[PDB]
Each structure stands twice: as C-alpha cells, then as structure tokens.
Subunit: 160 residues, 4 copies
C-alpha cells in the first residue's frame, strides 16, 4: 500500500513485508547542497530506515552531504550501530527532480536503488521482517528531500 | 513526476499536462465519516482541483460526506462555480485504506476514477492546460483523506 | 492476461473484455513499406479486429500502407462494412521497433493508441462486449508487423 | 522490448542485457501433464535459455514434468553441462492460465520467478552478458507452454 511518511516519524506497514517485497521512498525534491544548519550533532545526516517488530533497524540508509556518501548499516533496538558500509554519494541522484530510494528484499540481502538504478547490495545482519519505516534527520537540519515522502510497498506481481 | 500536496495548498506541475496526461491523487487514509466539526460554511467539503495557468479550475472534484456525493465542476478565475455534476459517494472508495482519485485526460473530457475504477466522464468546460493542482477544505473541518497527498503525473506506459 | 495471436487467426479472450478494459496488440517488428506483392484484392490491408460473441466486428483497425491511413470501422457478422473513419498513417509508427496498437474501452467509444500515443477516438456502433480478437491480411501480402502478435488484456488498476 | 520466441528457435536480444535487466518469458497456455510422446531421449524436457555471444548457455531453465522439478544449469558452448540445481515443480504454476518465467539479473546471480513469485536464485557460472534467448524441447515431445512465447526485456525503471 501507500503511506505518507513525515520527516521525523515512523509509519507502520499494514503487514510485515513479505519475501521479495519492494519499498519505494519518494520525494518531490532533491537538494544535494549540505544543510545550511549543521546543528549540535556535527553530522549532516538524513536517513530512512526499515524496522522490524522488535524495533531493530534492519536497514539504515543515510545520506551524508558533507561526507559525499551513503551510509548503510543495521542497528539493534537500543544498541549501538554495526560497522558502516559506504558508497560515494555523487553520481547517484540527479536524473529525477523527484528522487526515489527503492529497496528490494532478497533472502540474505537488500538491493538498494536510487532513481531505479541499483547502487548497492547490503547483506542482511539482523533477523525479522520489516514492519515499520522511518524518516529521520539530525537536530536542526534540513533534509535533501521533501519533508514528507510517499512510501509505497509493492511486489513484483503488483507491477506486472 | 511525483508531488507532495498539502491540505490547503497548491502545487505547480513541472510543465503543462500534455494530452492524455494522467494525474493520480494518493491518500494513505480514508475516513468517510463526515467531519465531526462542520464549521461556519455549513457544507462538509474537501476537494482536489486541476487548474490552468490563469487560475481557472478546469476540474473540481469535491467529496461531500454529508451529501453522499461527489461534486464535479469548473470555476473560472474570480467567477462563480458552474452547474454541478454529481454522482453518489457510496460504493466507490468502499473501505480500501489508501484511496486514490485518478484523472485521465481526454481531448474533450476527463475520465475520473476512484481506486482506479472509472466513476464518471466529465465534459471539459474551460480552455487551457492543467498547470497546477490543489487540495482544499472548508474552514474548520477535517478531511476524509490524509492531510498530505502524493500526486503523481504520468502518461500511459513509457 | 496474455494471448498468442497468429496472422490469419482469431483467438478467444479468456473472458469478455470488462468496462474500461485495455487490449494491447504487440508486434516485434515494424515495416511500413507496402507489401511487396499487392495481390488480387488490389488493397494492401493488414488488420486487427475486436469481435463480440455473435461474430460482429465491434472495431476493425486496418493499416493501409499504400493509402497512407488507418481505417476504422465496425462490421456486423455476415453483413457489409459501415462507413469508414480514416486518419493518416504517417506520423504514428513509430518510436520503436516493437510497435503496439492499444485499445482502451470507454462506455460509448474506443480510444486507439499507436505506441501508447492516442491517435483516435472511435464512437461505438455495435452492441456487445469484445470476446475475441483477430489478426488478418489480404491474400498474398506480408504484414507490417510480426506474423505473431502478443495480445495482452489489462485494466487501469493492474496496471 | 518485445520479441516473439518460437519453440525450437533462438532469438537475438536488441543488445546485451545490462545490469539488472529483466527478462520475462510469457506463455498463453499451461499444461503440466507429461508430454504424451516421450521420444528417444527418455527425458521429458522443455527449456528456455539465456545465451551469451559465444553461444554459452549462461542459464538453462528446464521443466521436467515426469521428475517434478525445474533444472537449472549453465552449459559452455559445445561442452557438457555442469552440475544441476533443482527445485520442485509442483506449487509454482497453477495460479494463472498464462504462465510466465521471469529472470531478474543481479551481479552474481539470477533471480528466477514463476508467475512473478520468486522461486530460486541461481549463482552465475559462466562469463559474458546475455545476448540471445532460446526455447527448446527434446525430440518428439509437446511443451507445457504455448509453442510461441512473448519475451519482454525490461529494466526496473520501465515499470
Ligand atoms: C569513538 C570511536 O570509537 N570512534 C569514532 C567513530 O565512532 C566516529 O564515527 C562516526 O560515528 C557516528 C556515531 O556512530 C556515525 O553517525 C551515526 O551513523 C549511524 C549509522 O552508521 C546512524 O544510525 C546515526 O544516526 C549516526 N549518528 C548521528 C548522530 O548522525 C558516523 O557516521 C561515523 N562517521 C564516520 C565513521 O566517518 C568517528 C566520527 O568521525 O570518530 C571516531 O573517533
Ligand atoms: C441562488 C439559489 O437559491 N441557489 C441555491 C444554491 O446556490 C445552493 O447550492 C449550493 O451552493 C454552494 C455554493 O456554491 C455549493 O458549494 C460549493 O460547491 C463548489 C463546487 O460546485 C465548490 O467550488 C465550493 O467549494 C463549494 N462552496 C462551499 C462554501 O463549500 C453547494 O454545493 C451547492 N449545493 C447544492 C447545489 O446542493 C442550493 C443547495 O445547496 O440551493 C439553491 O436554492
Ligand atoms: C458502393 C460501392 O461499391 N463503392 C465502392 C466502395 O465500396 C469502395 O470502397 C472500398 O471498399 C473496400 C471493400 O469494402 C474497402 O476495403 C475493406 O475495408 C474494410 C473496413 O472498412 C475491411 O474490413 C475489409 O477487409 C476491406 N476489404 C478488402 C478486400 O480489403 C476499402 O477500404 C474501400 N476503399 C475506399 C472507400 O476508399 C471504393 C474504393 O475506391 O470503390 C467504390 O466503387
Ligand atoms: C556419472 C554419470 O554418468 N552421470 C549420470 C548423469 O549424467 C545422469 O543425469 C541426467 O543427465 C541428463 C543428460 O545430461 C540430464 O538431462 C540434461 O539436462 C541438461 C541440464 O542439466 C539439459 O541441458 C539437457 O538438455 C538434458 N539432456 C537431455 C537429453 O534432456 C538429466 O537432467 C540428468 N538427470 C538426473 C541427473 O537426474 C543421471 C540420470 O539418472 O545418471 C548418471 O549416471
């Protein structure tokens, strides 16, 4: 289904994401210039995340404008981050004034696409099905996307 | 392309909608119960609109929960509404949680679908291409959809 | 729902086309040059047809390479054709080597698209829902499309 | 892009399949009962294949109605096959009358779907991009699909 995902909020999916589910995060704007306001955290960070019932972040997708990179990671509920997996940020967005981040579920990894082009395969690290998604940003910053995202959960059979 | 359309706002399209353009208004909420607060207007009205460069509402689609109806109309810039064309509200959205209103452009009419099922063909009345879309509601009411809609502009296939 | 439609054959739809049904005839080839041989009819004609249960051709879409024009019409079963509605052929095909003719059903008219671009609205003339489709050509000619077409029936909500 | 693929033929793709290319083989018929005639091979085998420029079968997808299984493998041109990877046949088809086998390319593997539901991930074994596809059957048998398939080559951005 479709979900409205407001910046700084978590939305519950209607049901756990089934095998091979696809999640599309849609923004209507793209601003790759770093947030004019860095704020108290010292890290320009806007992220989307796939969460399980327990609250673990199965997949964290962070955009780092000041670091020229995407940061992928998994974060167990109430625990610290795992090791980061990073790819350069430049050359990913651009072709769409309305950028999208799509994740395709696979048995042991997530296929991550930017504007429907695959940029990374992230090996799963934590157990459980995705049941929630979030869109967060470090205190006092402005995101690279619209402050509201359209999130669509779909299956291959839905687009065929 | 994709647009975020907030309640009581107008969004400009990236370009004028071309012939046979398709505009999909997506909500992640459905609440067919009339707005608990009716407000000063006395009319429970939440609507989406297609507007030309000149500010004319080419097509107005109103949801009237208190009247069991959809109201379609066109409103010239700074003038009054045209005659209203209505159809029942019941049996359209049903209870699907993410309702959508899709408008498919034709040369002389708009095909209107609720949840991708065609409900009405509205004969065009005003000239000009759709260049902006809006989402409005009468003072003091709560809408039957989410307060933010995802609006997608597309053309059949690729 | 997908169907194989060979040249000079008719194929039953799995069920009649429902309101607002979309039928897409897909070819893997395009050749707008007239058929090398004209044959005995003297009319270079290849066509696809939407037919009801009683055999009536609800909508006939003919491609006339030598006449520079599509021909639209309806033919009751066992009777002669009605008045033809023509549009030029030039300017339709084709942004692609695998052309398609898509028909979108509407209560009173069909919307005809070439390569998903609308080229004409044809007012319905005969009663009944489309339950079969055909792909036909005049004796001794070769078509502008592949000798086999993929026909897909879909609805806006599939999409 | 669309292509007509006849049984016992090989069709060239428009260009080598790019990363994440999706290939959909569509049939307008489904018949899982074993081929009435088995033939001299003694193996009821109908298959589709993805082939590179050198003629190597990058991926072989075989339906074995008398063995209750799909057989996946890669076969270098003019060389014997490698080890087979199999999954049961039962429970994959049956939901629709027009079955399809989709292959979604990944860097080191092919994601295989039956009726758009993923059934297997086959690790790539041979080098080179897919440039041809084929549809074959053992001598004297009839296939579980129509004798002509619609083959669509697309990329996620196309849907
Ligand atoms: C102290 C130590 O052992 N080493 C320091 C590193 O931990 C530190 O790396 C940065 O750490 C922060 C906090 O973990 C990272 O930011 C977090 O990233 C995760 C996803 O990986 C995300 O969920 C959090 O939202 C985000 N935090 C905030 C507040 O934005 C950050 O990416 C790391 N940066 C790196 C590794 O380049 C570095 C800081 O440069 O210092 C070490 O001394
Ligand atoms: C002069 C006279 O006696 N006529 C009365 C009608 O005017 C009245 O119609 C109602 O008028 C209002 C105001 O136009 C309509 O509401 C508006 O609807 C348009 C779309 O058509 C929309 O753009 C506006 O947002 C909306 N305005 C508000 C404030 O919500 C309303 O739908 C009409 N209702 C009808 C026709 O039933 C009718 C009864 O209402 O009585 C006549 O006697
Ligand atoms: C009254 C009279 O006899 N006048 C002649 C016209 O009938 C004739 O028109 C042409 O008629 C032929 C045959 O009907 C048309 O081709 C047919 O087109 C229909 C669809 O409209 C198609 O289903 C048939 O397959 C097809 N027949 C064949 C054999 O291909 C043709 O389009 C008409 N051409 C016109 C009207 O320009 C004209 C033709 O010059 O001659 C009159 O004498
Ligand atoms: C040690 C030894 O001799 N091994 C024998 C195995 O080779 C044999 O396996 C069967 O082999 C046949 C022929 O190779 C297999 O069919 C082939 O399958 C490939 C794809 O894997 C396909 O491309 C070929 O078209 C196809 N050949 C024909 C003619 O259809 C078949 O799947 C194998 N069946 C098995 C292994 O279950 C087994 C068979 O019992 O015997 C060994 O002794």
């Amino acid at each position: 289904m479709f979900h409205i995902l407001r910046l700084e909020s978590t939305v519950d999916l209607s049901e756990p994401l089934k095998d091979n589910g696809i999640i599309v995060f849609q923004s209507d704007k793209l601003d790759l210039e770093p947030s004019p306001n860095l704020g108290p955290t010292g890290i320009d960070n806007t992220n989307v995340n796939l969460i399980n019932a327990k609250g673990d972040v199965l997949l964290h997708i962070g955009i780092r404008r000041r670091e020229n990179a995407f940061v992928f990671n998994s974060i167990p509920y109430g625990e610290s981050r795992g090791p980061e997996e990073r790819i350069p940020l430049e050359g990913t967005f651009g072709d769409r004034r309305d950028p999208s981040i799509t994740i395709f579920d696979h048995p042991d990894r997530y296929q991550i696409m930017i504007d429907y082009k695959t940029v990374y395969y992230y090996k799963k690290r934590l157990e459980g099905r995705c049941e929630k998604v979030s869109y967060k940003i470090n205190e006092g910053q402005t995101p690279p996307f619209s402050d509201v995202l359209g999130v669509t959960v779909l299956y291959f059979a839905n687009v065929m």
